[PDB]
A = this chain, B = another copy of it.
Amino acid sequence: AKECRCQCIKTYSKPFHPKFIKELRVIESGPCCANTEIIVKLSDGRELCLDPKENWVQRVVEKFLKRAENS
Contact call B65/A26, Cβ cutoff below 8 A: yes
What is the interface of chain A mostly: helix, strand, loop, or mixed? mixed
Chain B's closest residue to A39 (CB) is B25
Given A23-B27, A24-B25, A24-B26, A61-B52 contact (CB < 8 Å)? no
CB proximity of A51 to chain B, nearest CB, Å: 10
Q: Which residues from B are CB-within-8-Å of A62?
A: 65
> How many Å lie between the Cα of A67 and that of B52 in the bound state?
11
Interface size class of A (residues with CB under 8 A): 20 to 34
Is A35 located at the chain interface by the 8 A CB criterion? yes
> How many Å lie between the Cα of A68 and that of B52 in the bound state?
8
> How many Å lie between the Cα of A51 and that of B35 in the bound state?
28
